Design an enzyme around this catalytic site. Structure first.
Site, PDB file in Angstrom:
ATOM      1  N   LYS A  41       1.000  -1.109   0.115  1.00  0.00           N
ATOM      2  CA  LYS A  41      -0.209  -0.123   0.163  1.00  0.00           C
ATOM      3  C   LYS A  41       0.895   1.310  -0.015  1.00  0.00           C
ATOM      4  O   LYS A  41       0.486   2.076  -0.730  1.00  0.00           O
ATOM      5  CB  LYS A  41      -1.010  -0.102   1.125  1.00  0.00           C
ATOM      6  CG  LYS A  41      -0.471  -0.227   2.582  1.00  0.00           C
ATOM      7  CD  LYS A  41      -1.438  -0.334   3.779  1.00  0.00           C
ATOM      8  CE  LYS A  41      -0.716  -0.489   5.115  1.00  0.00           C
ATOM      9  NZ  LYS A  41      -1.768  -0.508   6.096  1.00  0.00           N
ATOM     10  N   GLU A  72       3.761   6.140  10.355  1.00  0.00           N
ATOM     11  CA  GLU A  72       4.661   5.485   9.231  1.00  0.00           C
ATOM     12  C   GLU A  72       6.077   5.177   9.970  1.00  0.00           C
ATOM     13  O   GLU A  72       6.160   5.696  11.099  1.00  0.00           O
ATOM     14  CB  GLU A  72       4.597   6.490   8.161  1.00  0.00           C
ATOM     15  CG  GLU A  72       5.342   6.006   6.891  1.00  0.00           C
ATOM     16  CD  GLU A  72       5.149   6.874   6.015  1.00  0.00           C
ATOM     17  OE1 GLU A  72       4.589   7.822   5.762  1.00  0.00           O
ATOM     18  OE2 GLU A  72       5.631   6.531   4.767  1.00  0.00           O
ATOM     19  N   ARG A  73       6.768   4.562   9.149  1.00  0.00           N
ATOM     20  CA  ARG A  73       8.169   4.301   9.600  1.00  0.00           C
ATOM     21  C   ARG A  73       8.954   5.477   9.358  1.00  0.00           C
ATOM     22  O   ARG A  73       8.657   6.219   8.274  1.00  0.00           O
ATOM     23  CB  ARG A  73       8.746   2.959   8.833  1.00  0.00           C
ATOM     24  CG  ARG A  73       8.113   1.633   9.424  1.00  0.00           C
ATOM     25  CD  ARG A  73       8.664   0.496   8.687  1.00  0.00           C
ATOM     26  NE  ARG A  73       8.179  -0.973   9.099  1.00  0.00           N
ATOM     27  CZ  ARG A  73       6.662  -1.165   9.161  1.00  0.00           C
ATOM     28  NH1 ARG A  73       6.195  -0.510   8.271  1.00  0.00           N
ATOM     29  NH2 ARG A  73       6.409  -2.344   9.547  1.00  0.00           N
TER      30      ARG A  73
HETATM   31  N1  LIG Z   1       6.651  -6.006  -8.182  1.00  0.00           N
HETATM   32  C1  LIG Z   1       7.089  -6.148  -7.154  1.00  0.00           C
HETATM   33  N2  LIG Z   1       8.239  -7.155  -7.124  1.00  0.00           N
HETATM   34  C2  LIG Z   1       8.631  -7.578  -5.885  1.00  0.00           C
HETATM   35  N3  LIG Z   1       8.142  -7.058  -4.571  1.00  0.00           N
HETATM   36  C3  LIG Z   1       7.240  -6.175  -4.810  1.00  0.00           C
HETATM   37  C4  LIG Z   1       6.451  -5.827  -5.834  1.00  0.00           C
HETATM   38  N4  LIG Z   1       5.702  -4.717  -5.398  1.00  0.00           N
HETATM   39  C5  LIG Z   1       5.834  -4.665  -4.234  1.00  0.00           C
HETATM   40  N5  LIG Z   1       6.800  -5.525  -3.503  1.00  0.00           N
HETATM   41  C6  LIG Z   1       7.107  -5.524  -1.971  1.00  0.00           C
HETATM   42  O1  LIG Z   1       6.307  -5.061  -1.139  1.00  0.00           O
HETATM   43  C7  LIG Z   1       7.260  -5.077   0.047  1.00  0.00           C
HETATM   44  C8  LIG Z   1       6.174  -4.346   1.274  1.00  0.00           C
HETATM   45  O2  LIG Z   1       6.002  -3.273   0.942  1.00  0.00           O
HETATM   46  P1  LIG Z   1       5.341  -1.998   2.009  1.00  0.00           P
HETATM   47  O3  LIG Z   1       4.880  -0.762   1.174  1.00  0.00           O
HETATM   48  O4  LIG Z   1       6.166  -1.926   3.252  1.00  0.00           O
HETATM   49  O5  LIG Z   1       3.838  -2.704   2.421  1.00  0.00           O
HETATM   50  P2  LIG Z   1       3.023  -2.004   3.065  1.00  0.00           P
HETATM   51  O6  LIG Z   1       2.441  -0.606   2.359  1.00  0.00           O
HETATM   52  O7  LIG Z   1       1.796  -2.746   3.379  1.00  0.00           O
HETATM   53  O8  LIG Z   1       3.538  -1.751   4.637  1.00  0.00           O
HETATM   54  C9  LIG Z   1       8.432  -4.524  -0.536  1.00  0.00           C
HETATM   55  O9  LIG Z   1       9.379  -5.133   0.171  1.00  0.00           O
HETATM   56  C10 LIG Z   1       8.250  -4.958  -1.871  1.00  0.00           C
HETATM   57  O10 LIG Z   1       9.448  -6.011  -2.158  1.00  0.00           O
HETATM   58 MG   LIG Z   2       3.644   0.374   4.008  1.00  0.00          MG
END
Ligand SMILES: Nc1ncnc2c1ncn2[C@@H]1O[C@H](COP(=O)(O)OP(=O)(O)O)[C@@H](O)[C@H]1O
Ligand SMILES: [Mg+2]
Ligand SMILES: Nc1ncnc2c1ncn2[C@@H]1O[C@H](COP(=O)(O)OP(=O)(O)OP(=O)(O)O)[C@@H](O)[C@H]1O
Ligand SMILES: COCCOCCOCCOc1ccc(C(C)(C)CC(C)(C)C)cc1
Ligand SMILES: [Mg+2]
Lengths: 526, 487, 50, 170, 250, 140
Positions: free
Chosen positions: E47, E73-74
């Protein structure tokens, strides 16, 4: 004006009062006008009393303007709102305040009628949907729940049931015209704006008022929105009128009651609700009734909406409203996604009012659809995903589900003939794709009128004043039966000859898309 | 002598507290405040002492517009309800105030509502049988006098017609009145049942009615709905003791009686033990049920509808209800759509008096043989749907015929619906019914066809219909032969 | 037969876990209400004793 | 004079519907007449066949439903709703003195097809329709057949050969 | 920082589509300009990455202004976002910027983590009402705003509701969701993220957030583990302006 | 004792009315001590004390054939054995409906007379074989 005490503390929307030295008695559910300023006033209500002397109070307006030390005046009277026929055109506030857009007083909490002040339900309320009006018919005075997950068609069903009542109530007298009261609890103000603009676009607000308690509104105003709507329906009941009443929704009303009860330290229970939240909804839904001919024969119908989560029905509120309501409708997302709209589940959906609401022309039709669908499930469930089944049951059922798929309501005349054709097998030679175009040509166009076949004295599908003979005499009657069969046979032959031949010959790229769009437009307009 | 008066001191929902100046009255003692204040009469029963002068009281009506420190008159006792012949053909709330608008009730005496249960000496350990007259009940599920029965039926299964026929049969056979208690009843079904009790003449307004009605509706608070079944049982104990007879007690959903008691305990503040049912579940249920017992002086049997939330029998409210029930009249939509009425499924039903220590030996062996037969018939029907009837031996198809004959013979008409459908009703005795099923089991009546047993009662009565069918077929043959010979 | 034998056990453990999670949420709420009752103080109760 | 009438629950019911009939006949608009049936119900004095027929007489003889005009107004649907109320809700059946008004209305409106339904319904129920009105109905029918009013024009218009949503006018 | 929500007359719903460049969004959930969007999802689904991509695509071409609100957020994702906007020159100090960044992070207390979104709306409603511009309002995320007040209601003494949330949750969320709305003066095309703990849809905070949005985008572990990104379940998500008339019929 | 489950329900009423902190399956936590006070008073006394006795056959209700209930396992954690009646068998005609697999007597071998001990050994082996030979075929 003589006061009772002074505010002592507030917890958001909740307040508390400490009585003055001149100890004066205050009733339990009256109104308190708090003098937040020299002009502005904060209406409120008493909700509990205490031994030591104190008053827990719900605030209905101007919460931010409340401060300790303010004066607190009493009315000595229950809550009451404006009432009458001078409200059907205008949006409102559950305090009666008209909301802008770009005398007689009635009590919010009255006791419902006893059995002697009622009558068994005898007349139908046409939602305009073949699904509802055939297999789980809605009567007048017949409170019926609407369940389902998010974004299934709950509000669309409850709003098309309102849009259907504009074509009719204009025609018929103003005694039998079922009017309506939508009630939004905790819904977004833009949803309320779109409902306002839609009903204004289709002239449906002349027979439909709206009660608005938004998310920015107080919890007590969300708590009292449905009581305001019911109080509006009660004068129609006592004046003999018919009236509908929708709630979108009660789960938020119960969240608000939870908020109130927990902040006022009432003892909690299952799902952190108190015990009397079943009695809360029974105070409301039981006010719906089919009144007696000694009581004007008026009626208040109810369509309370309740949102489920992950198709749960073991939930407390869902269990309670099912235990209260006179039937139910159950929408499913697995069917909403599968092109089935409205996405009912006919087995879980029940109407204890089976036939007493239905018309003479409707009992035969809905009983045939029951004796078709009960078999259609035993057959469709056992067949594979890939088996071809050529049988009248599976054929008629698939075409009937296609006819059940439609955006927006349908006229009664339109609803009967298209299903009579299925139950009697006339809609069998057509394809599963072209059923709604068949219906569009049957209802709006007139193929035999175009192609010269005029061997029919009266029966044609352009007048639309014929349903008032269908409801009375019924199509099974001898004078209407053969003309009906001849019109349907000739329409079917003209279709299968002229149209169904041209259709299969359209083996191009853009023609198939233009035809898919034609069928999915016929699905909307029909 | 004078009467005690108290003053309100707080109101929280149904709960109200009443300060006094003297000895507090006992628990469940009624406290009335005049109708001029609230707009309607208002009664509150003491539940819970808080000190030497305070009395918490649950309220049965709406306490709106009730000011503080209003005077409140102690009735001197608990809720006195009417009792008698004048009670019949009427409706009464918990307090005995008639709500059917049909004028006052001319009663002689007025008994309190929380009467103690019969002592062990007053009990009668001898388990007896109630001759219902409905062969479907009598064979497999003998209604024991002074016992509890569960009734499982939704919509469109003939539940109303069944309970009406039960009222009729107990009213004519055993000469005993009955009583219904709608706890949390939908007011639409209340109208649809109060008008059916006029169309069926079970309540003859210009004559002799049979059942008492007590409707505590959903619009009433739980302090009332919880004390409805006690009202209807006070109505029934007069007919048990004074009239000295047998009585039925129909109880709308025990689920909603338990829910109402849970709401009472919530309002009182009692910590809910389990899913949300009160901690005092078994106590509040047993105080009701232990009054529903046979006696030396009469009997009260109780047919109780039960709702099972989420179809789970393990929930404590059903489990505690089953720990008191004695029989289970299950109803199925399948047999109802297949024409069988009453729509009882005997194999999934069950009873407790099914023991020759209680009942006679022949009635038990016959019933167990019919249960064996129908079980084997279910197995062979599951085989026929797979293999086919031609796969079965000559011995199997004989019992498949006799089982079909039995299932069609269970279909019985009703004197309740005799006006609606036209066909007569048949009150068939017990011993005659046992001899009928013993004949149909020993095969000495096998030449009769299957459809002749459809919608009849008694072997001595079906034979007239069999003769009528044979005469009809002979007349159709004599018509067709001469219609073909003339041309 | 096997699928039914598993389905009844699955429904049973499902309802077991449902009822236990409901009881748990209830006992959390009652624990909090009790902690708040402990947090609230007692008054004075001053009156004539003579 | 008037036989006894009883409610559902058995309570006595009034029969003196006299003055309400004049209260209906004085209604200048045929919705104030329907607003008298409310008071008749609330007075435990429901309407009789003669009362419903006075209401239909005023639905025919009045000019409009209310003082101001109304969109989609229709006398016929009003009458048939009164008839479905008489038959289905209450049980009373109409008579020749009622179908007379219904047929005179369909003759005035000129909807000859519904007129022929009314003639086939009076003839299915065993009623003798007035030959004056039958002749007027056949006259309007022949008139419309001569002037092409037998069907509208938008149905006689040729259908599009193309399967375009715009050509079909959805 | 606190102000009353726009009156129904002041509000304005204009059906106008936004082109994100993303291929799931452009078909199933066509985002409406001036409307509300919600990225429901657990942890580790993308997200925040979708928010970063939507910023990258929309805010450049957006002639109006933008506001980002980090709520729990982080701080590493906050640094990365600030350095990305600096490299893209969305934030141009010597020149002119068009992005406000407000940040109350996991390190911050609950009274801050609750009172961040209102600060971001003080920033946004000025550009909407006074300047009359169009505004973008990204929020990461509403669940930290929720649990910040859940962590405090117990200390306030409010009796807790079900699963461990505050009793005033619905009201508190509505007081923010109704302030987040376009008007006649301008249009906020808001985007919100939501944490669904344990992937449990029955959670009342998502259940109450469903109603208060127009594009309920949903992310799922089952699509994410299959190697498909953005891990959107088109059957579990559906928008509001997915109508026949608002968008093309084809 | 007919029955301990309803004794625990009555004490649960008393506890919840006293606002004592509940525990698993609504019970306070001292329901184990509650039952141990009752079932430890049962004993075979010593010859120093008269060699008397107090045998105790308590009854406990299960739910849908579930010996994993809290009270059921609390009482199995006290009693010197177990007799399990099955509703499956009670419905399937066998009465008494004892399940020999789920039933056991931990001490009664010493008390069983040799005439009955040998017959019980033979039938225990026979039924241990019958339980396996009856299930392995599964109508194959
Ligand atoms: N096309 C993609 N290929 C590989 N990994 C992806 C891709 N799209 C998103 N990700 C993964 O999503 C992960 C988690 O993202 P993050 O934004 O922290 O999730 P959230 O928003 O739920 O906290 C990242 O480590 C990333 O590797
Ligand atoms: Mg996130
Ligand atoms: N028969 C139908 N054909 C096509 N689309 C439909 C049909 N019924 C409903 N929809 C679509 O479903 C969407 C949501 O409808 P609706 O608002 O009634 O669902 P809801 O469950 O009430 O939503 P919410 O949960 O937000 O209240 C709308 O965009 C509407 O166009
Ligand atoms: C030998 O004497 C036996 C007497 O027993 C009397 C009490 O019986 C209790 C009833 O037990 C049941 C068992 C199953 C059910 C079913 C599973 C049929 C109920 C259902 C389908 C609603 C869940 C209902 C009641
Ligand atoms: Mg909706």
């Amino acid at each position: 004006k003589q006061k009772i005490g002074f505010v002592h503390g507030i917890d958001g929307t909740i307040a508390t009062i400490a009585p003055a030295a001149s100890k004066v008695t205050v009733p339990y559910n009256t109104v308190l006008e708090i003098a937040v300023s020299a002009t502005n006033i904060a209406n409120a209500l008493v909700f509990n009393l205490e031994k030591d002397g104190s008053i827990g109070v719900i605030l209905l307006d101007n919460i931010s303007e409340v401060r300790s030390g303010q004066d607190v005046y009493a009315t000595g009277s229950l809550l009451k709102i404006p009432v009458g026929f001078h409200m059907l055109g205008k949006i409102i506030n559950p305090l009666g305040k008209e909301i802008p857009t770009g005398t007689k007083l009635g009590l919010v909490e009255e006791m419902a009628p006893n059995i002697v002040s009622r009558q068994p339900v005898n007349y139908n309320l046409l939602t305009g949907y073949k699904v509802i009006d055939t297999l789980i018919p809605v009567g007048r005075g017949q409170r019926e729940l609407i369940l389902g997950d998010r974004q299934t068609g709950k509000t669309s069903i409850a709003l098309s049931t309102i849009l259907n009542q504009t074509k009719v109530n204009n025609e018929i007298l103003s005694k039998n015209n079922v009017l309506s009261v939508y009630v939004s609890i905790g819904q977004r103000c833009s949803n309320v704006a779109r409902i306002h603009r839609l009903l204004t676009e289709y002239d449906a607000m002349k027979y439909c008022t709206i009660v608005a308690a938004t998310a920015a509104d107080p919890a007590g105003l969300q708590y009292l929105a449905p009581y305001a709507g019911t109080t509006l329906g009660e004068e129609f009941r006592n004046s003999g009128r018919h009236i509908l009443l929708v709630y979108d929704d009660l789960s938020k009303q119960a969240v608000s009651y939870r908020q109130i009860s927990l902040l006022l330290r009432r003892p909690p229970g299952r799902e952190a609700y108190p015990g009397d939240v079943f009695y809360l909804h029974s105070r409301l839904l039981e006010r719906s009734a089919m009144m007696s001919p000694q009581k004007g024969s008026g009626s208040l119908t109810s369509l309370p909406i309740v949102e489920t989560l992950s198709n749960d029905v073991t939930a407390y509120i869902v269990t309670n409203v099912i235990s209260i309501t006179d039937g139910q409708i159950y929408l499913d997302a697995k069917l909403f996604t599968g092109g089935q709209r409205p996405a009912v589940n006919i087995g879980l959906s029940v109407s204890r009012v089976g036939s007493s609401a239905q018309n003479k022309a409707m009992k035969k039709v809905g009983g045939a659809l029951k004796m078709l669908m009960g078999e259609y499930r035993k057959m469709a469930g056992e067949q594979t995903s890939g088996s071809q089944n050529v049988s009248p049951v599976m054929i008629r059922g698939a075409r009937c589900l296609q006819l059940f798929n439609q955006k927006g309501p349908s006229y009664f005349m339109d609803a009967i003939v298209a299903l009579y054709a299925v139950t009697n097998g006339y809609m069998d030679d057509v394809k599963l794709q072209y059923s709604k175009f068949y219906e569009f040509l049957l209802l709006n166009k007139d193929l035999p009128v175009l192609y010269g076949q005029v061997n029919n004295k009266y029966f044609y599908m352009y007048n639309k004043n014929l349903n008032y003979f269908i409801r009375y005499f019924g199509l099974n009657h001898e004078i209407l039966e053969p003309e009906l069969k001849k019109y349907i046979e000739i329409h079917t032959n003209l279709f299968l000859d002229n149209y169904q031949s041209r259709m299969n010959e359209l083996k191009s790229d853009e023609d198939l898309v233009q035809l898919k769009n034609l069928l999915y437009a016929c699905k909307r307009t029909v | 002598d004078v009467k005690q008066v108290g003053y309100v001191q707080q109101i929280i929902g149904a709960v109200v507290d009443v300060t006094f100046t003297d000895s507090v009255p006992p628990v469940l003692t009624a406290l009335t405040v005049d109708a001029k204040e609230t707009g309607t009469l208002l009664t509150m029963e003491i539940v819970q002492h808080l000190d030497t002068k305070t009395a918490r009281c649950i309220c049965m009506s709406s306490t709106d517009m009730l000011r503080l420190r209003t005077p409140v008159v102690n009735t001197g006792s608990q809720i006195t309800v009417p009792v008698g012949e004048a009670t019949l053909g009427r409706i009464f709330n918990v307090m005995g105030d008639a709500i059917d608008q049909r004028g006052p009730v001319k009663n002689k005496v007025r008994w309190p509502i929380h009467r103690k249960a019969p002592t062990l000496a007053e009990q009668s350990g001898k388990d007896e049988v109630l001759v219902t007259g409905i062969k479907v009940i009598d064979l497999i599920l003998p209604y024991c006098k002074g016992g509890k029965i569960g009734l499982f039926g939704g919509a469109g299964v003939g539940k109303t017609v069944i309970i009406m026929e039960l009222i009729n049969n107990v009213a004519k056979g055993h000469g005993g009145y009955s009583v219904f208690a709608g706890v949390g009843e939908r007011t639409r079904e209340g109208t649809d049942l109060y008008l059916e009790m006029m169309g069926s003449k079970v309540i003859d307004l210009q004559g002799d009615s049979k059942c008492v009605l007590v409707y505590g509706q959903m619009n009433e608070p739980p302090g009332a709905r919880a004390r409805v079944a006690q009202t209807a049982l006070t109505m029934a104990e007069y007919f048990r003791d004074e009239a000295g007879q047998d009585v039925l007690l129909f109880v709308d959903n025990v689920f909603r009686f338990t829910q109402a008691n849970s709401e009472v305990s919530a309002l009182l503040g009692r910590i809910p033990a389990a899913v949300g049912y009160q901690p005092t579940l078994a106590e509040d249920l047993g105080m009701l049920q232990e009054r529903i017992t046979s006696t030396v002086k009469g009997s009260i049997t109780s047919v109780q509808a039960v709702y099972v939330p989420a179809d789970d029998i393990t929930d404590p409210a059903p489990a505690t209800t089953f720990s008191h029930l004695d029989a289970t009249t299950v109803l199925s939509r399948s047999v109802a759509e297949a024409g069988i009425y009453p729509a009882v499924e005997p194999l999934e039903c069950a009873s407790r008096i099914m023991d020759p220590d209680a009942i006679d030996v022949n009635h038990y062996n016959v019933a167990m043989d019919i249960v064996e037969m129908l079980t084997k018939y279910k197995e062979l029907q599951d085989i026929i749907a797979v293999l086919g009837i031609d796969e079965l031996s000559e011995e199997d198809k004989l019992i498949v015929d006799r089982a079909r004959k039995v299932a069609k013979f269970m279909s019985q008409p009703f004197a309740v619906a005799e006006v609606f459908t036209g066909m007569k009703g048949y009150y068939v005795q017990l011993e005659d019914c046992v001899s009928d099923f013993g004949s149909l089991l020993m095969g000495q009546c096998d030449n009769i066809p299957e459809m002749a047993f459809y919608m009849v009662g008694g072997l001595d009565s079906v034979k007239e219909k069999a003769a009528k069918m044979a005469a009809e077929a002979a007349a159709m043959r004599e018509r067709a032969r001469k219609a073909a010979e003339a041309k | 037969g096997n699928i039914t034998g598993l389905m009844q056990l699955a429904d049973y453990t499902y309802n077991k876990t449902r009822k236990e999670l409901i009881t748990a949420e209830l006992l959390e709420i009652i624990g909090t209400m009790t902690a708040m009752h402990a947090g609230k103080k007692v008054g004075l109760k001053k009156t004539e004793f003579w | 004079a008037g036989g006894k009438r009883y409610d559902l629950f058995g309570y006595e019911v009034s029969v003196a519907t006299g003055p309400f009939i004049e209260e209906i006949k004085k209604a200048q608009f045929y919705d104030d007449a329907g607003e008298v049936i409310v008071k008749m119900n609330l007075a435990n004095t429901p309407p009789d066949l003669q009362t419903y027929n006075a209401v239909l007489e005023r639905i025919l003889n009045c000019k409009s439903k209310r003082s101001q005009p109304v969109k989609g107004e229709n006398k016929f649907a009003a009458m048939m709703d009164i008839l479905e109320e008489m038959d289905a809700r209450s049980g009373i059946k109409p008579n020749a003195e009622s179908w007379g008004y219904v047929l005179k209305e369909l003759v005035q409106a000129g909807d000859f097809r519904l007129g022929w339904v009314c003639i086939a319904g009076m003839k299915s129920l065993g009623i003798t329709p007035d030959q004056a009105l039958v002749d007027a109905n056949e006259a309007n029918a022949a008139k419309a057949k001569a002037a092409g009013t037998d069907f509208p024009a938008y149905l006689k218009k040729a259908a599009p050969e193309s399967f375009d949503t715009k050509a079909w006018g959805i």
